[PDB]
Amino acid sequence: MFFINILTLLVPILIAMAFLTLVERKILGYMQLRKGPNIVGPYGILQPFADAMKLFMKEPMRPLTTSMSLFIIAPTLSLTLALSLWVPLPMPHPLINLNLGILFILATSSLSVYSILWSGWASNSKYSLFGALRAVAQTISYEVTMAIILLSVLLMNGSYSLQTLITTQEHMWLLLPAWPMAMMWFISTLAETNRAPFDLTEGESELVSGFNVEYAAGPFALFFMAEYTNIILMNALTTIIFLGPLYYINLPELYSTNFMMEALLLSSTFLWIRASYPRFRYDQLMHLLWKNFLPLTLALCMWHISLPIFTAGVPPYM
Amino acid sequence: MNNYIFVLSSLFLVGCLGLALKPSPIYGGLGLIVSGFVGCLMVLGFGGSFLGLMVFLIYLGGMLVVFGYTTAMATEEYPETWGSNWLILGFLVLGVIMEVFLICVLNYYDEVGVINLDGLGDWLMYEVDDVGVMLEGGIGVAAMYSCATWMMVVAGWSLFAGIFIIIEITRD
Amino acid sequence: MNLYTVIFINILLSLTLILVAFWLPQMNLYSEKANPYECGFDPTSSARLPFSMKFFLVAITFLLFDLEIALLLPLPWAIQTIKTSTMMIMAFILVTILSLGLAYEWTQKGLEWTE
Amino acid sequence: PGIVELPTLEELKVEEVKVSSAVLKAAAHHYGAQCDKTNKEFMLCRWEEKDPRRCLKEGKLVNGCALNFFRQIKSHCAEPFTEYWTCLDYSNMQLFRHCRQQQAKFDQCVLDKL
Amino acid sequence: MNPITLAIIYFTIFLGPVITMSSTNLMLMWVGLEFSLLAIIPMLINKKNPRSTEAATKYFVTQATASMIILLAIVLNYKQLGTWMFQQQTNGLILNMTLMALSMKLGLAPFHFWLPEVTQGIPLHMGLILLTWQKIAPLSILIQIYPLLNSTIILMLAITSIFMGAWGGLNQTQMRKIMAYSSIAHMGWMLAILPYNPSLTLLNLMIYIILTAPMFMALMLNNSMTINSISLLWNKTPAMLTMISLMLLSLGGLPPLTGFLPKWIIITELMKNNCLIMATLMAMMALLNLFFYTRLIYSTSLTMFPTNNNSKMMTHQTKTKPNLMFSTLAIMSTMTLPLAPQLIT
Amino acid sequence: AGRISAFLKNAWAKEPVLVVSFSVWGLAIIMPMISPYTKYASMINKATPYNYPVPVRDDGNMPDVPSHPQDPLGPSLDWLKNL
Amino acid sequence: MWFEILPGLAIMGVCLVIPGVSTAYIHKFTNGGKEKRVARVQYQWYLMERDRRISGVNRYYVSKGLENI
Amino acid sequence: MPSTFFNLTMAFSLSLLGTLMFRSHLMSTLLCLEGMVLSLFIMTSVTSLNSNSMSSMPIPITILVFAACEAAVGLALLVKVSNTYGTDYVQNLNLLQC
Ligand SMILES: CCCCCCCCCCCCO[C@@H]1O[C@H](CO)[C@@H](O[C@H]2O[C@H](CO)[C@@H](O)[C@H](O)[C@H]2O)[C@H](O)[C@H]1O
Ligand SMILES: CCCCCCCCCCCCO[C@@H]1O[C@H](CO)[C@@H](O[C@H]2O[C@H](CO)[C@@H](O)[C@H](O)[C@H]2O)[C@H](O)[C@H]1O
Ligand SMILES: CCCCCCCCCCCCO[C@@H]1O[C@H](CO)[C@@H](O[C@H]2O[C@H](CO)[C@@H](O)[C@H](O)[C@H]2O)[C@H](O)[C@H]1O
Ligand SMILES: CCCCCCCCCCCCO[C@@H]1O[C@H](CO)[C@@H](O[C@H]2O[C@H](CO)[C@@H](O)[C@H](O)[C@H]2O)[C@H](O)[C@H]1O
Ligand SMILES: CCCCCCCCCCCCO[C@@H]1O[C@H](CO)[C@@H](O[C@H]2O[C@H](CO)[C@@H](O)[C@H](O)[C@H]2O)[C@H](O)[C@H]1O
Ligand SMILES: CCCCCCCCCCCCO[C@@H]1O[C@H](CO)[C@@H](O[C@H]2O[C@H](CO)[C@@H](O)[C@H](O)[C@H]2O)[C@H](O)[C@H]1O
């Protein structure tokens, strides 16, 4: 029964990822006065399956300068970690109930950068090395504030448990008291997922394809599957932290339906943002995070230590 | 499951052997990441939680900086792996064989001393407060804010002074 | 057991896709195909030569700032203390000195990348 | 190098309070008020004596007191109490705040009846 | 360095040893040693040339390695006894690695090889801190556990340091290397007596420090880095010739100077404990130090080496140094043997 | 103090993020000192019973200790119930 | 037209509700018709283990009321 | 506990042996120091858990804090070495023999 539950998490999440590739291409198309896919299946709903089958039927690259162990490992690690991020998510009940589920997310997400670093290094080509070193800079930029932003929010939660966030927001979205942190959190998740305007580790106008430039066929598909799975994950996380879906102990599915709607909306704004802005320069992302977010994040952390003490609003331990 | 923690501490030992052989720092950095993960599992296995997750998170950040520094300042045309040099490979294999030998012999002479292969799993958790509530490791670490503030004063000073130190070292 | 089970399945699924991707397709290996890419011309050197890091000082500052947040992550347990004034002063002092450290590095041009 | 003295299995026989945690939690507030004197005697023995073998007599009075408390619920308030602990047992944390309706019905019963 | 950096770094250099000397917990003692290593590195490398970079790097890797071994001992003792201080019941191997690692931090032979190289690569005023202020914290730890230490390892470290400090200083033409070997020899004496009488360890440390501080100030006056440079003193600052000569003879332990007292008292105490053979060997090889100090006295005050024409322009200039701390330490390091009973008990 | 007002006004227009950071930092320090509810935060942490309240042996000289949990002696929590 | 984007969105939306709903139902099926018990602290684990021991069938979720005493 | 602490001490000894037996890269040695730190962190953490010593859990965190400062200084020094010589090889750091 636990194995059936693994299937009813992984398989729907992988289908949701596949169709986000379709939704992105149609939303971007319509914002560009185009249609996007509308031939391969009705309204393009078989286009993801065609791209998947094409890639896995394609010859995978075995470049000569490549260090092959890390070359294979990196895309394998990418999809593993992307899927693993979902197991503690409470929708409203998680597959794996973790006491420190938020810290699990940070550690797992932080290991995810090494798939980019090792693939770019292992490929042993100049454009892939450029992409890897941009990932180093990207993590230094946003990881400095992402955990402090989370810290301040969880001083109203009272724990690192994701399921507790549901109870914390029983009467109100955490957006309302924490909207300045929610704004900074939202920009951080864009950078954390290497999404536009911070799509720098791939950045195709500059590095051709950056970290994955030497990758073909099915190994290339794993990086793509991992990226689209993470976009859904980070927005679902944003939904549970700041937009507390309505919870009733006798109507759990109401939470799931409301969660999906808000998560779908937050994923749409990711595609909307990509269609709207130019790219940052990767030194400018570092200055955005370290000279704007970090001062305010530190001040707000101090404010959110101060708040529960002077309002006598310390949340319960349990 | 009675071999679980011994297997982990055995994996940790191999990771440090790999690091000690000092291949290219790229693979050294990877070796510490795996050892850090294995070390996190051991802390978890003994009832830890916060400490295990901290050390992995800290070492994930630490090795990312080392990766960046390696590509700029510690790289050669042909970075060495564990297999590249027959001499390093032999001492990797010999080191693993000497681990099996050392554990095997010590098991024979004492049987319950340092190695107790008969009793693995019987002496992991000693006492546990069965009906307790406030017991997790994060509570202990948090005493820096209340009962062990001197520990936090010195820790905070070293990070603060570290900023002034590294700025001085690095200016031309 | 459950967390081990699902992560192994995650590893198992990823490795199966890799095996399919490497054994299903028709191959055709020859030297020009597998040479490193560089926009149609040959590379003039190894990609393994030193690549200068202009943000190296920010990078090692990040090492210290990452241990600062490690000192902050017990705060959810620390706010449960009876010694609220002590905890609050320690947290306020910790955040303020980290801000002063950032402020100093900022005014020393330590966040500017080298040229 | 002395022999550790252990009570016999026969000395350790008692009438078990073998009801589930939701049953205990549902009754826990009235139980604490009704069986306090016996319960506080046993806990004072344990903390003063630091030896579970020295407190077996008081431990058995704890079990008898708990069974006399639950037999009063059974004879007078069985149905209000069953409706309450069954609702409380649904929650993954067995939270009081999800069954205030059933708690009030049980509380009113043990007030009028007992 | 701007003033804010100087204040923070110098404060941390001062703070580390104060933490070590005041700490009950062995972990806080280790923290104190950590502050010392971190804070002194930017001062070592401040001038930024290849030699100072080499000196700071060699200092860092030695000191950090020794710090890990010390931490291992503290952690092993915490595992054994559930406490954060060494006891009578602490495993002897744990105590022997503490002694090994602290002696490597101090530069005692045979863990000495780094110290003459680092001293040579840094400015004189930093050599002064390295050989005086930086000795106090590791010694302070050792003094706390003096009943627990193994007399065999100590005497072997001690005699080795005296032997190599002696032979080491005999080959030097660089002043910074001569002081480093003088440090190693005197540390050998400090350590030999620690397990018997730690008060005499402190007596030797104090007399060594007030001899070494004014010797470094005398080198600093004209920046004399070599024998040939210091041999020009007769033309540049002849007034210093009397006090340098007496400080050198005092460092060598010649009576009736104050520096005879530490060697005299340590021999007395070693022989109260029947440590006759080591005391004889120590005292005999300490004469080799007096040889290379004498050769130094020969080239400064007892003969006049050739001078150069540009030195006349120096005689037209006025100096503002030394400060009056030089005269105080110079006099008290040479002329206080009559007050010996007030210094030992 | 007209020179600072022009300074603060320019900083608000040109460096609003830093102005907000310093203002929030200053407010966080000030608010606990002037708030009437600051005293309760410690009192609430003190009223949470994570440990069993071990009874005391009655020696006949404890007029202040309740003999039962529903005695009118001992610490009341009415302040928190109506907080 | 923009509303032709919706077929992909509906498929996405259905796929994102299944995990939450399926986990909630599978928990009740495998925990005696109740929510799966959460043991954040050792006290909660102790209660589950006691529930398992008194159940008669080695299942914590099979509850025993006053009919058992 | 018995066998785990033996393996952890062996892991420290190997990391120290790595530190003491240089190859060419200074960075490879800096990684060995981080290995000793990691071993000592787990040993301290496991000891505190096994003895239920909650008042000692600050200490493992302080071990990592100062190790981060040690590692930051080590990397800062390595930048200086690389600037002088264009590599991090330790054989170049030999000017102070004379
Ligand atoms: C890098 C990976 C390294 C792998 C290291 C090796 C892993 C395997 C561990 C083997 C060590 C002994 O492993 C196992 O220990 C348990 C105790 O838990 C012993 O326990 C069992 O057998 C022994 C007697 O033979 C008795 O204790 C008893 O009958 C039973 O408990 C097993 O017989 C032994 O096989
Ligand atoms: C030169 C640089 C140094 C100066 C800068 C540092 C100033 C000192 C600031 C840290 C102050 C620590 O202050 C110290 O706090 C601890 C708790 O942590 C108090 O400790 C008190 O409460 C604890 C709680 O467990 C009791 O166990 C203990 O017996 C009792 O003394 C000390 O009584 C107080 O002296
Ligand atoms: C105990 C030892 C047992 C005996 C071992 C014998 C091993 C001999 C292996 C022969 C090679 C098989 O390996 C496979 O060969 C094919 C064609 O031969 C090549 O495969 C690919 O490259 C060549 C390039 O022209 C194409 O012609 C071929 O159609 C394509 O599939 C690769 O080289 C390899 O994928
Ligand atoms: C150089 C670094 C500078 C940055 C660091 C500055 C730190 C200074 C902090 C000043 C603010 C202290 O704010 C202080 O908060 C505490 C509680 O926390 C309040 O304390 C009040 O509530 C507490 C409960 O918490 C009661 O027990 C107490 O009797 C009452 O005074 C004080 O009334 C207020 O003065
Ligand atoms: C050395 C021990 C004795 C001194 C004790 C320490 C206190 C010293 C107090 C005086 C320090 C003031 O020193 C001052 O520092 C600031 C740091 O903001 C430096 O100034 C820095 O920020 C300002 C911003 O306007 C600019 O000058 C520039 O961006 C940067 O240099 C000044 O160039 C220096 O003059
Ligand atoms: C137990 C007995 C104690 C004995 C005390 C020892 C006294 C000091 C002995 C060392 C002598 C100092 O060394 C002596 O210094 C004086 C200056 O002071 C020099 O004096 C001479 O040369 C200098 C220039 O060099 C002239 O400026 C000076 O006027 C002239 O007299 C001597 O040429 C030198 O030999």
Q: How many C-beta atoms surround the C-beta of residue E46 within 10 A? A: 17
B77 touches C: beta carbon within 8 Å:
yes
The continuous run of DSSP H or E covering A250 comes out as none
Q: Which ligand is nearest to the CA of C103?
A: 5
Cβ–Cβ under 8 Å, residues E253 and E259 = yes
d(CA F48, CA E257): 71
Cβ separation of G15 and A4 shorter than 8 Å?
no
| 3-class SS of residue C49 | coil
Could you tell me which of B19, B107, B5 has the C-alpha nearest to residue H42?
B5
d(CA F69, CA G16): 51
**Which residues form ligand 1's pocket by a CB distance below 6 Å?**
B 2-3, 6-7, 10-11, 117-121
Minimal C-alpha gap between H90 and chain E (Å): 9
Could you tell me which of B58, H71, B150, B64 has the C-alpha nearest to residue E68?
H71
Residues of B in contact with H57 (CB under 8 A): 51, 137, 140-141, 143
Q: What angle do CA F72, F76, F79 make, to 5 degrees?
A: 140
| 3-class SS of residue E144 | helix
Cβ–Cβ under 8 Å, residues E314 and E192 = no
Cβ separation of B168 and E38 shorter than 8 Å?
no
What part of B 21-50 touches A (C-beta under 8 Å)?
A: 26, 30, 33, 49-50
Q: Go through C44-57 and write b for each residue having 16 or more CB atoms within 10 A of its CB, e for each that does not.
A: eeebbeebebebbb
Residue with tokens 């708990």: D66
d(CA A4, CA G22): 9
Could you tell me which of G20, E306, E299, F61 has the C-alpha nearest to residue A260?
G20
- Is residue E7 within 6 Å of ligand 5 at its C-beta? yes
C-alpha distances out from residue A104 to A233, A283, B50, B56, E75, Å:
14, 29, 10, 10, 28
H3 touches E: beta carbon within 8 Å:
no
Residue type, A33: L
| 3-class SS of residue H29 | helix
The continuous run of DSSP H or E covering E181 comes out as helix E175-193
C-alpha distances out from residue E266 to A62, E239, H9, Å:
73, 34, 39
Domain range annotation of chain C: 2-115
**Which residues form ligand 6's pocket by a CB distance below 6 Å?**
E 234, 238-239, 241-242, 245, 301
Could you tell me which of A131, A299, A277 has the C-alpha nearest to residue A200?
A131
Torsion of CA D59, D62, D64, D68, to 10 degrees: 180
Count of structural domains within chain A: 1
DSSP assignment of B39-94 equals HHHHHHHTT-SHHHHHHHHHHHHHHHHHHHHHHHHS--SS---TTTSHHHHHHHHH
Nearest CA to ligand 3 atom 23: C28
Nearest CA to ligand 1 atom 9: B3
d(CA A86, CA A154): 20
Distance separating the N- and C-terminal Cα atoms of chain B: 56
A93: which residues sit within 8 A by CB, 6+ positions away? Answer: A163, A252, D92, G20, G23, G24, G27, G35, G36
Q: What angle do CA E82, E87, E90 make, to 5 degrees?
A: 75
Cβ contact A–G (≥3 pairs, < 8 Å): yes
Nearest CA to ligand 6 atom 18: E239
CATH code of residue H64: 1.10.287.3510
d(CA E231, CA D14): 98
The DSSP symbol for A44 reads: G
Token pair listed for H72: 């930051």
Cβ–Cβ under 8 Å, residues A133 and A203 = no
d(CA A154, CA A167): 12
Beta bridge partners of E226: E174
Count of structural domains within chain E: 1
Minimal C-alpha gap between A162 and chain B (Å): 15
What ligand 2 atom has the least distance to the C-alpha of B150?
10
Minimal C-alpha gap between C72 and chain H (Å): 11
Task: Give just the sign of the alpha carbon dihedral A53, A54, A57, A61.
Answer: negative
Cβ separation of G24 and A93 shorter than 8 Å?
yes
d(CA C106, CA C112): 8
Long-range contacts of H91-96 (CB under 8 A, 24+ apart): H91/H24, H93/E53, H93/E54, H93/E57, H93/E58, H94/E54, H95/E50, H95/E51, H95/E54, H95/E121, H96/E51, H96/E54, H96/E55, H96/E58, H96/E117, H96/E118, H96/E120, H96/E121
HEC assignment per residue over chain D:
CCCCCCCCCCCCCCCCCCCCHHHHHHHHHHHHHHCHHHHHHHHHHHHHHCCHHHHHHHHHHHHHHHHHHHHHHHHHCHHHHHHHHHHHCCCCCCCHHHCHHHHHHHHHHHHHHC
Cβ separation of C7 and A302 shorter than 8 Å?
no
Minimal C-alpha gap between G1 and chain D (Å): 47
Question: Helices (H), strands (E): how many in chain E?
Answer: 19, 0
Residue type, E238: P
Q: What is the resolution of this structure in A?
A: 2.4
What ligand 6 atom has the least distance to the C-alpha of E233?
25
Torsion of CA C95, C99, C100, C101, to 10 degrees: 100
Cβ–Cβ under 8 Å, residues C28 and A59 = yes
C-alpha distances out from residue G5 to A28, A36, A236, F78, G16, Å:
10, 9, 21, 58, 17
**Cα G45 vs. chain centroid, distance in angstroms?**
16
Token pair listed for E6: 């100087």
Could you tell me which of D61, D104, D103, D36 has the C-alpha nearest to residue F71?
D36
B71 touches A: beta carbon within 8 Å:
yes
Plot region of A283 (φ>0 → left; ψ -120 to 50 → alpha; else → beta): alpha
Cβ separation of F55 and D48 shorter than 8 Å?
no
Residues of C in contact with F48 (CB under 8 A): 80
Q: Which approach determined this entry?
A: cryo-EM
Q: Go through E305-323 and write b for each residue having 16 or more CB atoms within 10 A of its CB, e for each that does not.
A: beeeeeeeeeeeeeeeebe
| 3-class SS of residue B3 | coil
Q: Go through D43-75 and write b for each residue having 16 or more CB atoms within 10 A of its CB, e for each that does not.
A: bbbbeeeeeeeebbebebbbeebbbebbeebee
The torsion angles phi and psi of E226, rounded to 5 degrees, stand at -135, 170
Residue with tokens 């791939």: A202
Cβ contact E–B (≥3 pairs, < 8 Å): yes
All partners of chain F with 3 or more CB pairs under 8 angstroms: A, C, D
For ligand 5, the distance from its centroid to the CA atom of residue B159, given in whole angstroms, is 20
Cβ separation of D40 and F55 shorter than 8 Å?
yes
Nearest CA to ligand 5 atom 28: C107
**Cα D9 vs. chain centroid, distance in angstroms?**
23
Long-range contacts of D82-85 (CB under 8 A, 24+ apart): D82/G65, D82/G66, D84/D26, D85/D20, D85/D22, D85/D23, D85/D25, D85/D26, D85/D27, D85/G65
| Chain G residue whose CA is closest to A318 | G40
Q: Determine the structural domain holding residue E44 and report its residue range.
A: 2-344
d(CA A198, CA A234): 15
The torsion angles phi and psi of H25, rounded to 5 degrees, stand at -75, 130
Beta bridge partners of H89: H25
Count of structural domains within chain H: 1
Minimal C-alpha gap between A24 and chain F (Å): 33
Could you tell me which of A91, A88, A74 has the C-alpha nearest to residue A131?
A74
Residue with tokens 């309302």: A176
For ligand 6, the distance from its centroid to the CA atom of residue E174, given in whole angstroms, is 24
Token pair listed for D29: 């507030």
Token pair listed for E8: 């923070």
Q: Determine the structural domain holding residue H82 and report its residue range.
A: 2-98
| Chain G residue whose CA is closest to A36 | G5
In the CATH scheme, what is the homologous superfamily, with its name and number, of domain C2-115? Answer: NADH:ubiquinone/plastoquinone oxidoreductase, chain 3 (1.20.58.1610)
Q: What angle do CA B9, B11, B13 make, to 5 degrees?
A: 70
Could you tell me which of E177, A310, B33 has the C-alpha nearest to residue F29?
A310
HEC assignment per residue over E207-233:
HHHHHHHHHHHHHHHHCCCEHHHHCCH
| 3-class SS of residue F45 | helix
What ligand 4 atom has the least distance to the C-alpha of F30?
11
The DSSP symbol for A151 reads: H
C115 touches A: beta carbon within 8 Å:
no
Token pair listed for F45: 């942490």
Q: Which of C6, C21, C51 sits opposite A218 (nearest CB)?
A: C21
Angle E175-193/E151-170 helices, nearest 10 degrees? 160
Using CB atoms within 10 Å of the CB of residue E45, give its burial: 0 to 12 exposed, 13 to 18 middle, 19+ buried. Answer: buried
Residue type, H34: E
The DSSP symbol for B134 reads: S
- Helical segments of H1-98, H only: 2-20, 26-50, 58-85
Domain range annotation of chain G: 1-68
Could you tell me which of H71, H73, H93 has the C-alpha nearest to residue E49?
H93
Residue type, G38: V
| 3-class SS of residue A99 | coil
What ligand 4 atom has the least distance to the C-alpha of F29?
11
Plot region of H51 (φ>0 → left; ψ -120 to 50 → alpha; else → beta): alpha
Cβ–Cβ under 8 Å, residues E325 and E216 = no
Minimal C-alpha gap between B159 and chain A (Å): 15
HEC assignment per residue over A190-216:
HHHCCCCCCCCCCCHHHHCCHHHCCCC
Testing ligand 3's pocket by substitution, the residue of C28, C31, C33 carrying the most ligand atoms inside 8 A of its CB is C28
Testing ligand 3's pocket by substitution, the residue of C23, C26, C29, C30 carrying the most ligand atoms inside 8 A of its CB is C29
Torsion of CA E48, E54, E60, E62, to 10 degrees: -160
Cβ–Cβ under 8 Å, residues B147 and B139 = no
Using CB atoms within 10 Å of the CB of residue B36, give its burial: 0 to 12 exposed, 13 to 18 middle, 19+ buried. Answer: buried
DSSP assignment of A9-33 equals HHHHHHHHHHHHHHHHHHHHHHHTT
For ligand 3, the distance from its centroid to the CA atom of residue C33, given in whole angstroms, is 17
| Backbone Cα Rg of chain B | 21
Q: Which ligand is nearest to the CA of C105?
A: 5
Token pair listed for A112: 């995810």
A297: which residues sit within 8 A by CB, 6+ positions away? Answer: A145, A148, A149, A152, A181, A184
3-state helix, strand, coil in chain E (%, to 5): 75, 0, 25
Token pair listed for A53: 């089958």
Minimal C-alpha gap between D45 and chain G (Å): 22
Residue with tokens 């998680």: A94
Cβ–Cβ under 8 Å, residues E37 and E61 = no
Token pair listed for D26: 């549902």
DSSP assignment of F18-44 equals HHHHHHHHHHHHHHHHH-TTHHHHHHH
d(CA E206, CA A255): 75
How many A/C residue pairs have CB atoms within 8 Å?
183
The continuous run of DSSP H or E covering E318 comes out as none
- Is residue B152 within 6 Å of ligand 2 at its C-beta? no
Q: Which ligand is nearest to the CA of C90?
A: 4
Cβ–Cβ under 8 Å, residues E177 and E321 = no
Q: Determine the structural domain holding residue A145 and report its residue range.
A: 2-318
C-alpha distances out from residue A318 to C79, F50, G39, Å:
13, 11, 11
For ligand 1, the distance from its centroid to the CA atom of residue H4, given in whole angstroms, is 14
**Cα E147 vs. chain centroid, distance in angstroms?**
24
